[PDB]
Design a protein around this nucleic acid. Sequence first.
DNA 1: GCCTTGCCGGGTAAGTTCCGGCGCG
DNA 2: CGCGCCGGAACTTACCCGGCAAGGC
Length: 188
Amino acid sequence: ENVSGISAYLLGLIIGDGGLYKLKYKGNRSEYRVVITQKSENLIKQHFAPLMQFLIDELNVKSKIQIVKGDTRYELRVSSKKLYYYFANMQERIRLFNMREQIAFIKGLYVAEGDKTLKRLRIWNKNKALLEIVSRWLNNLGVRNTIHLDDHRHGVYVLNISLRDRIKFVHTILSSHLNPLPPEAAAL
DNA sequence: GCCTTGCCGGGTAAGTTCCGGCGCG
DNA sequence: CGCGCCGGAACTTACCCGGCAAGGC
Ligand SMILES: [Mn+2]
Ligand SMILES: [Mn+2]
């Protein structure tokens, strides 16, 4: 559908490097933010914001894409109650992702929380249940993997891709053309 | 004599929630 | 009055990085 693919990729970034926030203010004002953060300004302005802007347009959401500069990172922010529930509802129906959405999610999840050097193929997160979902997805795709508690200080688990299948992983998932191409996959 | 990978500490690139605006029924 | 979009940025830590060494082949 391509809209389903971009959505799942973006969701991976959001759960990875950002989040969905339902704010309540004084009073009783409110706000619903869809947020991705990244240190690099080019990566937000050039690769993420275009994808989000396409999605904004295909759902007839007319919030704008805000790019806020913070002390330690840039924030791509959409203040929209409709876009918030679009992604929230997608997140609770995540085990029902078809295969096109599975590759797209793992892609964006790897961009956000993943070992960007690819010398090893690792992905970190405190959500063990979300990594077990991805683990089943990888297995059914023939990419063997493991989950251990990488960081005892903060309770962060790691999903390690076995390097046995490193070319299966990089060429099939990080490099698929059936949905948007990651930072270092579009070259290679 | 490699390679894979569990484990671990360093600290930065993330994440989270407050602020003060405005608009609209 | 009630609620939802802008634009900013302060406040902690969850990621990532990369070393080490144990275990396979
Ligand atoms: Mn994360
Ligand atoms: Mn990241």
